[PDB]
Amino acid sequence: VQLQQWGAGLLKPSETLSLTCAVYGGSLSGNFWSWIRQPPGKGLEWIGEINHSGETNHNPSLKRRVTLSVDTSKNQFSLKLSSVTAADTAVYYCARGGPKVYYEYWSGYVNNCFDPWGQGTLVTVSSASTKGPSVFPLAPSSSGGTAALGCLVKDYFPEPVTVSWNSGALTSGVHTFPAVLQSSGLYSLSSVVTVPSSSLGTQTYICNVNHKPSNTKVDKRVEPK
Amino acid sequence: HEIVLTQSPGTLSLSPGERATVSCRASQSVSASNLAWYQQKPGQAPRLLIYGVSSRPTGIPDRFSGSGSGTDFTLTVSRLEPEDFAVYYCQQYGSSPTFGQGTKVEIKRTVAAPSVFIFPPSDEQLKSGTASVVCLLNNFYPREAKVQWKVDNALQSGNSQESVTEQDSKDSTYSLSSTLTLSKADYEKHKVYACEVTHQGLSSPVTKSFNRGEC
């Protein structure tokens, strides 16, 4: 049994999020089928479940916003989440839940743990428009031995940006940090590298910043001030 | 009225070949054996590890086991393999499904103090009306480090954001950046911009600073 899922990616607040999961190698009638989300860097939150006859159970805090549906002929099931906000930004997973059983005196669904899982679909909810970053130098100061320098990649949307140094010829000692979501709704990150301080007068350091969503490419040379 | 699952500790720092033990406590009794465990590696979906408190689905090696009842459950890995360093979650299904907050198992190494660097905002950015001051903590262990921003001795609050790298695959250290953001007007009202770093690897807190407008 294998699961494939797809749907929207970027949405604006107040839109309706829609996703679909397709089941291969098995029938929907044997199980409950769930949606589970994970905000970036956060834990897991169960959203709701649906079975082949359309019966549903919901996370009580999300029940009023969730609509689940099943297409038994296609062996697919879907999630609709209405009136999205930035708080709904998350990787959404579909998953097979507990099986339907027929015991001598009882029938129903049991053992509602999750296996297997879909690969997950990142959904981003934001009112920001697509915007390329501004790139600013993080200049090296001035025995010692080791110096630090970098590039500040500020105010872009959406994710992601890639950073290389000297067109890929400098990799050792590089740290490109995860982006942070600023209060403005735009992302920002920095990429730093530590180098020998003796070579600052004869070595050149250029950060290559590429923002594919805005078709932006910026090369910034970082020199001591 | 959901069942709340609380895991402890939040982070385990261990080496391959050592035992890991994760606790999961519930705010209400979990009926029957209705508790599962999951493992999640970065960029992957969670993977069912234990079900029915103590059962392993096919393919889960027997170094993983589970125990408990009622409001108290335990996951244990008898001897850790390198692939076992990941985040682990408990989940109950006696009621509407809920998960624990996750427990990260990371690689234990010797204490390493951070090398600290402070970066003033560039002239170009100041022209646009914003000042970003960046503080860099490079290649430290353990991950727990405290960065405070002090502007002319005044402790800043609410105007900074942090970012931390994942544990390095080669030296098992972490790196962290803290960015203090002020408008150009606010930035020019002050002189001393200082980044104060507290970390177990330091005998006393390390402060890096610069005076605005000077070399």
Numbering used by the authors:
A (entry chain B): 2 to 82, 82A, 82B, 82C, 83 to 100, 100A, 100B, 100C, ...
B (entry chain A): 0 to 27, 27A, 28 to 94, 96 to 214
Paper excerpt:
The PCDN family is a lineage of antibodies isolated from an individual participant in the International AIDS Vaccine Initiative’s (IAVI) Protocol C, a longitudinal study of neutralization breadth in HIV-infected individuals. The donor in question, PC76, developed a broad serum response targeting the N332-glycan supersite (also known as the high-mannose patch), one of the key epitopes on Env, which involves N-linked glycans and amino-acid residues around the base of the hypervariable region 3 (V3) loop. All thirteen of these antibodies have a cysteine (Cys) residue at position 100 k, which is located at the base of CDRH3. One PTM that has been less frequently discussed in the context of therapeutic antibodies is cysteinylation, in which a cysteine residue in the antibody forms a disulfide with a free cysteine molecule.
